[PDB]
Amino acid sequence: DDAELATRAIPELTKLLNDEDQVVVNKAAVMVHQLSKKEASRHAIMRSPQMVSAIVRTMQNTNDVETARCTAGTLHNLSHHREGLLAIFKSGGIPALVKMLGSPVDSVLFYAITTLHNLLLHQEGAKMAVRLAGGLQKMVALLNKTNVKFLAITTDCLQIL
Ligand SMILES: CN1C[C@@H](c2cccc(C#N)c2)Oc2ccccc2C1=O
């Protein structure tokens, strides 16, 4: 029933993610991120190409810190599934994630590189897409960070490319 109800709510949540009111978009992004933490509702989000497109679009245009963390966090969760990596890939997720590599918000930064690593690992076409978006230069720029786990994931992205 969790999956069926998340499924019905999706079109309205997709609509509110594209709203002009920034408080409406933030609240919808908080909602969708919460839905992405439960496997039944994460399944429903991955099956909606329109919903994944709205999370990508919102993530790359938002100036709201919580909105950026919630939307990148949502993509991070969906990237742990094959039917999730594919939806991110088709919705223009790679260029948006590459832009997020320039975030001063460290959780957005960690979510962005982990999702991109999951993509470079199992998504066909992700290698060339990361390169076309300038991800090679962006990832090299991060090698100056000091967190051990973050540096290793970033170095494996470059070792994969
Ligand atoms: C949310 N956001 C947009 C922008 C920003 C605006 C206002 C406050 C902060 C903080 N802290 C950051 O900075 C970014 C730059 C590049 C990629 C992504 C971000 C990003 O994460």
For the chain, give every domain's residue range: 1-161
User: To test ligand 1's pocket by mutation, which of 98, 103, 110, 138 has the most ligand atoms within 8 angstroms of CB?
Assistant: 103
d(CA 64, CA 123): 29
d(CA 89, CA 83): 10
d(CA 6, CA 4): 6
DSSP letter string, 42-88:
HHHHHT-HHHHHHHHHHHHH---HHHHHHHHHHHHHHTTSHHHHHHH
Structure tokens at 132: 């076309």
Residue nearest to atom 18 of ligand 1 (CA): 103
Supply φ then ψ for residue 136, to 5 degrees: -65, -45
d(CA 15, CA 100): 23
Q: Please work out whether the CB of residue 95 comes within 6 Å of at least one atom of ligand 1.
A: no
Residue with tokens 């999370």: 55
Residue nearest to atom 7 of ligand 1 (CA): 63
Rg (CA), the chain: 15
Residue nearest to atom 4 of ligand 1 (CA): 63
